[PDB]
């Protein structure tokens, strides 16, 4: 059929032997091959990693709840540890960290080549510990930012009423049990406006994502027909298809979802499902474009490797990871109630009012 | 266009290369012979046969040469090397068959050394080989 | 009698099999093997790396001054193309294009939409290949300029005269002939003063490094005896020592050497050679502080691997790796109420000349 | 009058700025204290005789002799040189700026004439007393061989810090086994006299250069 | 401002509805 790439294997073996022979430190073959595994996994896909025995044990059970962390969720798509999203209600967000900016060094250690997992692990620490991050803002001059890491506990959902008849549902992060809270907030809001609403500006911006089950629950809340997300990957078990229950606490309210450059996989799932099913109107800026799903594959003996086993897909053929979510209307956030604060929210609320008026009664 | 190593083939070839570089050449030859048997690919047989010839063994060299020649019929050098190695063992009718197969594609041919190697066997085999050579001459 | 790493190779084979049979995008074996080579080269120490075809070619262009180009170095200023410097005495730069020229179009595509690096690559190409570009100056009608790509030698050392009797040599980078260049400069330098130099301020601030031989050559050009630097490594060939020829164009003139925080291995070699030997006054900030002489071993393919063959040691026997040189004066960048550090160096040189009298 | 300091591991700073009967002994006192603070002969002493109105002439002669052991300090009645020099042999860089008048410059004067010290700073203020050579202090005043006008130097803080190889992960260990210094936050615990005053910084830098190239 | 903002709503609203 086809010839084996024996030339490349021979070249690798000879390279290994020459590296062992002509190196400074006495380096044994075991370390060389372990580094080979680590680096092939790293170069193949930045999110993938080789969780060895001790790392596997650490992943099996959480160490402790005392450890806090900056909270920012990062991604190595740019070659450095890029800040995909500073989670709301967190010291990182309160600082000058803005999604899309890089992190060159952490506490004085450059992160030009180190893996994302190592950088994130070094980020987490004891409550109240100071830390200095060197952040390259849109290719500008690097600057140092001092932050105090602490335990992170972000309320999932926040329901306000921008105007009698108009709601506003901010989803900070897709933690567990987000579906229950979202449904309860929708119910209490519906009660607030006498069991009827004219709009609901679901604010999924600067969202670092979360549990896919909770995202599917949220997308179900507003939907009664069609699928939310379906996965694709080479392994047999890669495909996973999700459905929407007919019941809906939304009550057919016209919707406007706001998309900011800090959107993540789960927020992308909800936004893409709502947009593709023609049940919403995306209004913010472009999304981020992260949809890969990583599954830990058990190894031969008390080892494992986290590899990107599949990627998500919105109900249409569009793949969120490849292109992200492209909103129907692109409104750039800027300074001019929550409406009076940001330009995106004011534009969305005005659009909802205009749509309500122009639809007739 | 490039085949893909199976797990066992990859592991065996890696350890064979490591052994060959660490001077444990017997391990390399054995692993390469086994991989030539299983995979049946040209390149593996090529490396196995070159290693076997360098070492100088006869049985492994013959087996690997036959596997290589069958796995790469296009390669005339493979065919003539297999014929030579077989002639080392006292078989020559297959040697002349392989020489004729090479004769289809123009290239360097080995006839005098094989004739010398076949002139020392039993009289019947040499007579049959000479008859076959004369018939081939009538064919050319 | 050392056994092969049988179990470790078993784990490697299993890992490669799973990676190929689980990763979403169909990835062929060759890619994963190349990634593994890159990984086991890069994960040992930061500086060791695996150089592919393009990386090896560009490194070869780096360590040797000559490279294919138009004889002009340019850049982008706030999204606008401006001519930076035409290299003198280069056939490709003989066009003498006006400084600050804004090339509107290169190779049939406007400069807009592509980064300055992409535009430079578009200008760059095989030697002997003519190119045509479109330029508009001061809002005038665009015109076509024809240029001839050629192999241009790039100077690495720049010489100046700051005060009558005092000079200044800046080594932007260490290249194959950099040492020679330095020597040449020194000669012409003394000619500018009719054969008498009262001092000199070598500038090695922000010098990423280069070939070791060039560093040794420049150090010897500034030295007249003793060992300049000696390398140590596990292998036999790495173990090496260098010397200094008695000849010295410097003429034993007072020397002040500047080292910044960006003075990497090769510049650190010259700095340490001139410091551990009482020959020059170091002044500045601590150097980057890396000593590891690497070797570009050529593989069977065009691509090559760069590996940290050995460390280097200064004449005193102290290794500067991971700690860096500590300048004697220890001057930091500041302002006086243009180059404060160089002004301090010149003041120190003049004061030393005066206190030395004749 | 005297006031000592240690600007560097071997670079004392013996301010005087005033001459009196006491200073004749206090100069040697602070010199001994500096010698004990830094063992062995210092690398170089910066005698900041600036803004000094003057004082008792004999005390000035005592200080001069405490710095040099030979020669005639000033002739007009002449002052000789004793064999005892508590200063040992330190490269002395006296400072004169314009307030150096009469007695103060006398201490400078002899030094500048005996080559024992270098007069760094702006020109000095300048019966009659003469320096050891024919040149006087009233005929033309003291002209320092190095003129360093007073100035202020303000270091600029860099937001971005250039990482050293100590920061890089998995860097090779030091060749000699010595400890590797990390690149932590760097700041001045106290504003040193060098960065505050430009003339003093120039004097210290010249002393360091002289010591590194020329012995002592 | 007022006219320009209505202009966005003048057509931005219609495209959201489509036809």
CSV table of N, CA, C and O in Angstrom, one decimal, chain D residues 33-97:
chain,number,residue,atom,x,y,z
D,33,UNK,N,38.4,55.2,62.3
D,33,UNK,CA,37.1,54.6,62.3
D,33,UNK,C,36.8,54.0,60.9
D,33,UNK,O,36.2,52.9,60.8
D,34,UNK,N,37.1,54.7,59.9
D,34,UNK,CA,36.9,54.2,58.5
D,34,UNK,C,37.8,53.0,58.3
D,34,UNK,O,37.4,52.0,57.7
D,35,UNK,N,39.1,53.0,58.8
D,35,UNK,CA,40.0,51.9,58.6
D,35,UNK,C,39.4,50.7,59.3
D,35,UNK,O,39.6,49.5,58.8
D,36,UNK,N,38.8,50.8,60.5
D,36,UNK,CA,38.2,49.7,61.2
D,36,UNK,C,36.9,49.2,60.5
D,36,UNK,O,36.7,48.0,60.4
D,37,UNK,N,36.1,50.1,60.0
D,37,UNK,CA,34.9,49.8,59.3
D,37,UNK,C,35.2,48.9,58.0
D,37,UNK,O,34.6,47.9,57.7
D,38,UNK,N,36.3,49.3,57.3
D,38,UNK,CA,36.8,48.5,56.1
D,38,UNK,C,38.2,48.1,56.4
D,38,UNK,O,39.1,49.0,56.4
D,39,UNK,N,38.4,46.8,56.6
D,39,UNK,CA,39.8,46.4,56.9
D,39,UNK,C,40.7,46.7,55.8
D,39,UNK,O,40.4,46.6,54.6
D,40,UNK,N,42.0,47.0,56.1
D,40,UNK,CA,43.0,47.3,55.2
D,40,UNK,C,42.9,48.7,54.6
D,40,UNK,O,41.9,49.4,54.9
D,41,UNK,N,43.9,49.1,53.9
D,41,UNK,CA,43.9,50.4,53.3
D,41,UNK,C,42.7,50.5,52.3
D,41,UNK,O,42.5,49.6,51.5
D,42,UNK,N,42.0,51.6,52.4
D,42,UNK,CA,40.8,51.8,51.6
D,42,UNK,C,41.2,51.9,50.1
D,42,UNK,O,42.3,52.2,49.8
D,43,UNK,N,40.2,51.7,49.3
D,43,UNK,CA,40.4,51.8,47.8
D,43,UNK,C,40.6,53.2,47.4
D,43,UNK,O,41.2,53.5,46.3
D,44,UNK,N,40.0,54.2,48.1
D,44,UNK,CA,40.1,55.6,47.7
D,44,UNK,C,39.1,56.4,48.6
D,44,UNK,O,38.0,56.0,48.8
D,45,UNK,N,39.6,57.5,49.1
D,45,UNK,CA,38.9,58.4,50.0
D,45,UNK,C,38.5,59.7,49.3
D,45,UNK,O,39.4,60.3,48.7
D,46,UNK,N,37.3,60.0,49.4
D,46,UNK,CA,36.7,61.2,48.8
D,46,UNK,C,36.6,62.3,49.9
D,46,UNK,O,35.7,62.2,50.7
D,47,UNK,N,37.5,63.3,49.8
D,47,UNK,CA,37.6,64.3,50.9
D,47,UNK,C,36.8,65.5,50.4
D,47,UNK,O,37.2,66.4,49.6
D,48,UNK,N,35.5,65.5,50.8
D,48,UNK,CA,34.5,66.5,50.2
D,48,UNK,C,34.7,67.9,51.0
D,48,UNK,O,33.8,68.3,51.7
D,49,UNK,N,35.8,68.5,50.7
D,49,UNK,CA,36.1,69.8,51.2
D,49,UNK,C,35.4,70.9,50.4
D,49,UNK,O,36.0,71.8,49.8
D,50,UNK,N,34.1,70.8,50.4
D,50,UNK,CA,33.3,71.7,49.6
D,50,UNK,C,32.5,72.6,50.5
D,50,UNK,O,32.1,72.3,51.6
D,51,UNK,N,32.2,73.8,50.0
D,51,UNK,CA,31.4,74.8,50.8
D,51,UNK,C,32.0,75.1,52.2
D,51,UNK,O,31.4,75.3,53.2
D,52,UNK,N,33.4,75.0,52.2
D,52,UNK,CA,34.1,75.1,53.5
D,52,UNK,C,34.6,76.5,53.6
D,52,UNK,O,35.5,77.0,52.9
D,53,UNK,N,34.0,77.3,54.6
D,53,UNK,CA,34.6,78.6,54.8
D,53,UNK,C,36.0,78.7,55.2
D,53,UNK,O,36.7,79.6,54.8
D,54,UNK,N,36.5,77.7,56.0
D,54,UNK,CA,37.9,77.7,56.4
D,54,UNK,C,38.0,77.4,57.9
D,54,UNK,O,37.1,76.7,58.5
D,55,UNK,N,39.1,77.9,58.5
D,55,UNK,CA,39.2,77.7,59.9
D,55,UNK,C,40.7,77.9,60.3
D,55,UNK,O,41.4,78.6,59.6
D,56,UNK,N,41.1,77.3,61.5
D,56,UNK,CA,42.4,77.5,62.0
D,56,UNK,C,43.4,76.9,61.0
D,56,UNK,O,43.3,75.8,60.5
D,57,UNK,N,44.4,77.7,60.6
D,57,UNK,CA,45.4,77.3,59.7
D,57,UNK,C,46.2,76.1,60.1
D,57,UNK,O,46.4,75.1,59.4
D,58,UNK,N,46.6,76.0,61.4
D,58,UNK,CA,47.4,74.9,61.9
D,58,UNK,C,46.6,73.6,61.8
D,58,UNK,O,47.2,72.5,61.6
D,59,UNK,N,45.3,73.7,62.1
D,59,UNK,CA,44.5,72.5,61.9
D,59,UNK,C,44.5,72.0,60.5
D,59,UNK,O,44.5,70.8,60.2
D,60,UNK,N,44.4,72.9,59.5
D,60,UNK,CA,44.5,72.6,58.1
D,60,UNK,C,45.8,71.9,57.8
D,60,UNK,O,45.9,70.9,57.1
D,61,UNK,N,46.9,72.4,58.4
D,61,UNK,CA,48.2,71.8,58.2
D,61,UNK,C,48.2,70.4,58.8
D,61,UNK,O,48.8,69.4,58.2
D,62,UNK,N,47.6,70.2,60.0
D,62,UNK,CA,47.5,68.9,60.6
D,62,UNK,C,46.8,67.9,59.7
D,62,UNK,O,47.2,66.8,59.6
D,63,UNK,N,45.6,68.3,59.1
D,63,UNK,CA,44.9,67.4,58.2
D,63,UNK,C,45.7,67.1,57.0
D,63,UNK,O,45.8,65.9,56.6
D,64,UNK,N,46.3,68.1,56.4
D,64,UNK,CA,47.2,67.9,55.2
D,64,UNK,C,48.3,66.8,55.6
D,64,UNK,O,48.4,65.8,54.8
D,65,UNK,N,49.0,67.0,56.7
D,65,UNK,CA,50.0,66.1,57.1
D,65,UNK,C,49.4,64.7,57.4
D,65,UNK,O,50.0,63.7,57.1
D,66,UNK,N,48.2,64.7,57.9
D,66,UNK,CA,47.5,63.4,58.1
D,66,UNK,C,47.2,62.7,56.8
D,66,UNK,O,46.9,61.5,56.8
D,67,UNK,N,47.2,63.4,55.7
D,67,UNK,CA,47.1,62.8,54.4
D,67,UNK,C,48.4,62.5,53.7
D,67,UNK,O,48.5,61.5,53.0
D,68,UNK,N,49.4,63.4,53.8
D,68,UNK,CA,50.7,63.2,53.2
D,68,UNK,C,51.8,63.3,54.3
D,68,UNK,O,51.6,64.1,55.2
D,69,UNK,N,52.9,62.6,54.1
D,69,UNK,CA,53.9,62.6,55.1
D,69,UNK,C,55.2,63.3,54.7
D,69,UNK,O,56.1,63.4,55.6
D,70,UNK,N,55.2,63.9,53.5
D,70,UNK,CA,56.4,64.6,53.1
D,70,UNK,C,56.0,65.9,52.4
D,70,UNK,O,54.9,66.2,52.1
D,71,UNK,N,57.0,66.8,52.2
D,71,UNK,CA,56.8,68.1,51.5
D,71,UNK,C,56.5,69.2,52.5
D,71,UNK,O,56.2,69.0,53.7
D,72,UNK,N,56.5,70.4,51.9
D,72,UNK,CA,56.1,71.6,52.6
D,72,UNK,C,54.7,72.0,52.2
D,72,UNK,O,54.5,72.2,51.0
D,73,UNK,N,53.8,72.1,53.2
D,73,UNK,CA,52.4,72.4,52.9
D,73,UNK,C,52.3,73.8,52.2
D,73,UNK,O,51.8,73.9,51.1
D,74,UNK,N,52.7,74.8,52.9
D,74,UNK,CA,52.6,76.2,52.4
D,74,UNK,C,53.8,77.0,52.9
D,74,UNK,O,54.2,76.9,54.1
D,75,UNK,N,54.3,77.8,52.0
D,75,UNK,CA,55.4,78.8,52.3
D,75,UNK,C,54.9,80.2,52.0
D,75,UNK,O,54.1,80.4,51.2
D,76,UNK,N,55.4,81.1,52.8
D,76,UNK,CA,55.0,82.5,52.7
D,76,UNK,C,56.2,83.4,52.4
D,76,UNK,O,56.4,83.9,51.3
D,77,UNK,N,58.3,81.5,57.6
D,77,UNK,CA,57.2,80.7,58.2
D,77,UNK,C,56.7,79.6,57.1
D,77,UNK,O,56.0,80.0,56.2
D,78,UNK,N,57.2,78.4,57.3
D,78,UNK,CA,56.7,77.3,56.5
D,78,UNK,C,56.4,76.1,57.4
D,78,UNK,O,56.9,76.0,58.5
D,79,UNK,N,55.5,75.2,56.9
D,79,UNK,CA,55.0,74.1,57.6
D,79,UNK,C,55.5,72.8,57.0
D,79,UNK,O,55.3,72.6,55.8
D,80,UNK,N,56.2,72.0,57.8
D,80,UNK,CA,56.9,70.8,57.3
D,80,UNK,C,55.9,69.6,57.3
D,80,UNK,O,54.7,69.8,57.6
D,81,UNK,N,56.4,68.4,57.1
D,81,UNK,CA,55.6,67.2,57.0
D,81,UNK,C,56.2,66.2,58.0
D,81,UNK,O,57.4,65.9,57.9
D,82,UNK,N,55.3,65.7,58.9
D,82,UNK,CA,55.7,64.7,59.8
D,82,UNK,C,55.8,63.3,59.2
D,82,UNK,O,55.3,63.1,58.1
D,83,UNK,N,56.4,62.4,59.9
D,83,UNK,CA,56.6,61.0,59.3
D,83,UNK,C,55.3,60.2,59.5
D,83,UNK,O,55.2,59.1,58.8
D,84,UNK,N,54.4,60.6,60.3
D,84,UNK,CA,53.2,59.8,60.6
D,84,UNK,C,52.0,60.2,59.6
D,84,UNK,O,51.7,61.4,59.6
D,85,UNK,N,51.5,59.3,58.9
D,85,UNK,CA,50.3,59.5,58.0
D,85,UNK,C,49.2,58.5,58.3
D,85,UNK,O,49.2,57.5,57.6
D,86,UNK,N,48.3,58.8,59.2
D,86,UNK,CA,47.3,57.9,59.5
D,86,UNK,C,46.4,57.5,58.3
D,86,UNK,O,45.6,56.5,58.4
D,87,UNK,N,46.6,58.2,57.2
D,87,UNK,CA,45.9,57.9,56.0
D,87,UNK,C,46.5,56.8,55.2
D,87,UNK,O,45.9,56.4,54.2
D,88,UNK,N,47.6,56.3,55.6
D,88,UNK,CA,48.4,55.3,54.9
D,88,UNK,C,48.6,55.8,53.5
D,88,UNK,O,49.1,56.9,53.3
D,89,UNK,N,48.2,55.1,52.4
D,89,UNK,CA,48.2,55.6,51.1
D,89,UNK,C,46.9,55.2,50.4
D,89,UNK,O,46.8,54.1,49.9
D,90,UNK,N,46.0,56.1,50.4
D,90,UNK,CA,44.7,56.0,49.8
D,90,UNK,C,44.6,57.0,48.6
D,90,UNK,O,45.0,58.1,48.8
D,91,UNK,N,44.2,56.6,47.4
D,91,UNK,CA,44.0,57.6,46.4
D,91,UNK,C,43.0,58.6,46.7
D,91,UNK,O,41.8,58.3,46.7
D,92,UNK,N,43.4,59.9,47.0
D,92,UNK,CA,42.6,60.9,47.6
D,92,UNK,C,42.1,61.8,46.6
D,92,UNK,O,42.9,62.3,45.8
D,93,UNK,N,40.8,62.1,46.5
D,93,UNK,CA,40.1,62.9,45.5
D,93,UNK,C,39.4,64.0,46.3
D,93,UNK,O,38.2,63.8,46.7
D,94,UNK,N,40.1,65.1,46.6
D,94,UNK,CA,39.4,66.2,47.3
D,94,UNK,C,38.5,67.0,46.4
D,94,UNK,O,38.8,67.1,45.2
D,95,UNK,N,37.5,67.6,46.9
D,95,UNK,CA,36.5,68.3,46.1
D,95,UNK,C,36.5,69.8,46.5
D,95,UNK,O,36.5,70.2,47.7
D,96,UNK,N,36.5,70.7,45.5
D,96,UNK,CA,36.5,72.1,45.6
D,96,UNK,C,35.5,72.6,44.6
D,96,UNK,O,35.5,72.3,43.4
D,97,UNK,N,34.5,73.5,45.1
D,97,UNK,CA,33.4,73.9,44.3
D,97,UNK,C,33.3,75.4,44.1
D,97,UNK,O,32.6,75.9,43.1
